């Protein structure tokens, strides 16, 4: 009987036509263009978008002025603006459909490390984020693919507790300092 959770479900879908070339030759760009961990990491975002677009498309079959459409719609749109994809109150649904992967990539943390100077080359970003150098707001974030809420864009910054940012120069500079004090001095 036990306590425990289950409800574990995949975050992704693998492609059917297993190596088209054309599909590979897109999905590689995406990996370089933005320094992605792996191929899957695309078809994560690929799977997540296809949800949205099918959620949206689910609504486009309904008649207008119907309690669901209006509610689920706003909720859904807000959720996109909230993370900074639809803009300004573009917020009327049909539009959702016209939208591509590039977007839920551009709002990953990794990208918005060098987009806001901070890093210096896209892979620094993914290193720097893993290396527990950068923080958001107050939490120190470990994860590259944390989609950044639009609000929480200006609060990405070098952690208070890291070498660049301040305090405790890392062990490499601490050792090559102690080589000058202990070894040389």
């Amino acid at each position: 009987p036990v306590a425990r959770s289950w409800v574990c479900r995949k975050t992704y879908v693998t492609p059917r036509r297993p190596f088209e070339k054309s599909r590979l030759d897109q999905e590689l760009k995406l990996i370089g263009e933005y320094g992605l961990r792996n191929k899957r990491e695309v078809w994560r975002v690929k799977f997540t978008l296809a949800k949205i677009r099918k959620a949206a498309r689910e609504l486009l079959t309904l008649d207008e002025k119907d309690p669901r459409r209006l509610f689920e719609g706003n909720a859904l749109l807000r959720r996109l603006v909230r993370i900074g994809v639809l803009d300004e109150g573009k917020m009327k649904l049909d539009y959702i459909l016209g939208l591509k992967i590039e977007d839920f990539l551009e709002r990953r943390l990794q990208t918005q490390v060098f987009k806001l100077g901070l890093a210096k080359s896209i892979h620094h970003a993914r290193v720097l984020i893993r290396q527990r150098h950068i923080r958001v707001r107050k939490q120190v974030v470990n994860i590259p693919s944390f989609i950044v809420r639009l609000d929480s864009q200006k609060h990405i910054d070098f952690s208070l507790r890291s070498p660049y940012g301040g305090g405790r120069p890392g062990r490499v500079k601490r050792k090559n300092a102690k080589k000058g004090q202990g070894g040389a001095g």
Partner: protein, 126 residues
């Protein structure tokens, strides 16, 4: 110097004879805090002596900037040795329990049925 213990969600539990709230320990690069210090620093806080404060919970989260948890305060040690569970009194040298250890109990108590009611043999025991 840098700890700053701020509390949340204080309740005056008339009927368990207590004050109880979420401890929110800030702490910078220095690592966790022990429950002894936190008791003594929460003692002068509400002015009840360290003696009558029981703390568990304490869960830190990334960066090491902050650690939440639950602590709480009875109006006399006499009540604390009454409302409080064993583990929290035994946490610091005030009340301990036997070390028979579970399968010694079970092996014994499944005997003493074998014997009838001659106390001498039940006292025979293991």
């Amino acid at each position: 110097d840098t700890v700053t213990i701020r509390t949340r969600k204080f309740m005056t539990n008339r009927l368990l004879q207590r004050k109880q709230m979420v401890i929110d320990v800030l702490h910078p690069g220095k690592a966790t805090v022990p429950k002894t210090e936190i008791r003594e620093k929460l003692a002068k806080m509400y002015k009840t002596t360290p003696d009558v404060i029981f703390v568990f919970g304490f869960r830190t989260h990334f960066g090491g900037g902050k650690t939440t948890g639950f602590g709480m305060i009875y109006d006399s040690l006499d009540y604390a040795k009454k409302n409080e569970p064993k583990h929290r009194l035994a946490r610091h040298g005030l009340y301990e329990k036997k070390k028979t250890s579970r399968k010694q109990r079970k092996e014994r108590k499944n005997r003493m049925k074998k014997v009838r009611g001659t106390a001498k043999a039940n006292v025979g025991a293991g």
